[model samples]
Target: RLPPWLKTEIPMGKNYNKLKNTLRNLNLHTVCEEARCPNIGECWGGGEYATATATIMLMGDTCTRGCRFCSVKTARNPPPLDASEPYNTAKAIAEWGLDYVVLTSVDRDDMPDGGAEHIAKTVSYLKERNPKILVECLTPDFRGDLKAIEKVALSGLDVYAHNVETVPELQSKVRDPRVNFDQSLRVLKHAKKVQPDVISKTSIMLGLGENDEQVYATMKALREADVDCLTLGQYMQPTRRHLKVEEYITPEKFKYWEKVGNELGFHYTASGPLVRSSYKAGEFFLKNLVAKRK
Candidate 1:
């Protein structure tokens, strides 16, 4: 019953299996693995043209905030952070010899600073272990606390990302009550303000009953916040309990939005049915940008 363009090949390849084993052996979790991302095959695929990219999920698997669009599990207080996770994560990524890496985490509202220090420590360790690696963090809003946001932004991270998730009109319906459009934007704005050279990125999910005007308005809001990159993707239902896909946005519509996003002054825009927050297309572009500016 799904459209042809939305379907993807099964995730399999020499690199895919090897990456899977590496993550399992290291006791690491990835959004690509947990969220059942359809583009996992392409991102982890091995071939002459492929550059395997994985989004490492820090903290624990369970999140404190339960958003309708996300597949990650939630509990009021999940397990405590692992003391060795930072060192182990840095060692694993550095050994892989990757030039760019993404570190993201579940919302830990149970913590006083929303687990900001834990993320900062991880990035710091990674950078120290591998100075050549470009690190990008897809961080939580930290409840819009400026100090918490600054902790990670100034922790030697090349890119600081926080997703707005959707248009403002759909915020209350699609996201947790504790987060809103303005709050998410404030996180991105503050990160750029704290570290002017750090690339700021955010994502939005389409096909969630948002109109063209609303999407355009969201882009304008992001530009005003000084966000450098944007990604727009379809909102697929992860389970029967999750929010249902209100629409299956066609590839053409995604193309239209990408064009609009770039014209609106985003340094890079990755818009597709299969695009995600820590996406390869955006990563590849940012890697080059980070290289030139360095």
Candidate 2:
């Protein structure tokens, strides 16, 4: 059962439906739909709730890894990559004129580079079409391939993000095989090392039975790697077949952790019950940070 705080408004309105039709017409995908994000209503509906954020998925919906917490379908190998997705995605987001957009993808472990090039090209297209807009690429670990990390790091993206997914103790249970906390951190560190110009960000989901000690330590580890931004959100299982929620954190604690993250040296942090890997506050903050860097 969901706690009252976890309840969210349904996604609707002119822009929401317009973006939905636009995505369908453009043949694009978004993690908001695929991952069933709770804030889709506020994100899609650009009202007072508009915090300046949106998401799009790349490659295809079929992931190559099966994480217990995720509902995205997985296979050892998925369909061939779409060559036109980058251009079409650029066209749609450019027309929307959104200040910030997040481009993520299903893990394509079947490919040698794990679809890193696909995400890089997508970022390139978005920046080329609308350099005034900020683009954030929420990428996979590419099975710990440093070359894959290098590909996306220097893709002219404003922000390079890879979710740590959970605290160290719960990584084995929450994430798929080989997507460990250590490797995830290394990927963030590598992005910083490769392209210090691009901000490095990572997210962690609570409600997986993790404790404060581990969560606080995870913040320290990310800070040590020089990760610039962080997001902490309550995890909602997409279906009964997925991992069950062990705890429903409160809004107060989310605020508390946001403070903790700031004290830990993160330039920006978004924490709340309905928050996700791509939250509006984080996106807008990064957008401003990008401008400040100029």
Candidate 3:
């Protein structure tokens, strides 16, 4: 059962189908569909604007980690990397004339470098082929490999995001055992150092039985890490095997967090019932912010 606040219409529209086939034809996967994102309607239905966005999952759709709350398929070893994907991804975005694009991926613990270079290459090639397009890379902790983190940081991505997922106290219960809050914050910190101007971002999902104090601690810790952007969203269970929703945070609470983020001096924050880390609104704002700086 879903709460009234979580209900959304099925995604079916002209632009949605157009981009859907574009992804399949190029052998690409957008994790948004598998994540069962609540913002699908607005994102896929962004219509004609260059700001219309979609987050394509890279490396492959099979995740090496089995986070308790995520619905993405988990496998110890998924398919080998598609050597042509980096080329095809840029081609699709170039053809769509997209001004903003997001690339995320499954945890590739199987890879020696944790697929950091693979993600970097995709961003590199995209920028090379489409110079004007802005790219956001939502990457992993690389198992806390700073070398791998630095590899992706130097790539031509405009924004770098690695989700903390939740507050520290709830991490072990909400995420995979291998994922740690301090490690994630370290990754975010290292990225900012490697790419000083690139926006460092993270996300926190509420409704995991976490209290307001925990949420505030996580936000303050992220700020201490010099994270420039944050997004907060309500967590919804994707299946019976996944963790149940312990709370249905009201829109009012989301608004409150947004204000708190502002007071904390974050450059940008997106907090709402349906917000996601690679949120379109944040992407567009980041795009313009970068352009204005240039």
Please give the CA lDDT of all the candidate structures: 0.82, 0.81, 0.80
**Whose TM-score is greatest here?**
1
Please, what are the lDDT tens digits per residue for candidate 2 over residues 1-294? 567998777777676777667666554566777767777766764544344467877887777666788767776778887799888888888876566788888777678998888888888888888898778898888888999999999899988989998998988788876779999999999999989898888989999999999999999999999999899988888778889999899999999999998788788888899887677743446343533432
After superposing candidate 1 on the true structure, give the runs of residues whose Cα lies further than 4 Å from its correct spot. 12-25, 45-49, 281-283, 286-294
Every model's TM-score:
0.91, 0.89, 0.90
Clashes of 1: 0
Candidate 1 residue lDDT tens string, 118-230: 88999999999989877889888998999999999999998898999999999999998889998999899899888998989999999889999999999998999999889
Residue pairs in clash, model 2: 29-57
Cα RMSD (angstroms) for every candidate in the order listed: 2.6, 2.9, 2.8
Model 3 agreement with the true structure over 1-294: per-residue lDDT tens digits: 566777777877776677666666654556667767767656764533425577888877777567789867877777888888888877777776555678887788788888888889889889988888778888889999999999999998888999999888998899888889989999999999989988888888999999988888888888889998889999978779899999889989999999999999888778887888866753446443544432
Residue 42, candidate 2: Cα error in Å is 2.1
**Runs with alpha carbons beyond 4 Å of true place in candidate 3:** 10-27, 34-36, 45-50, 281-294
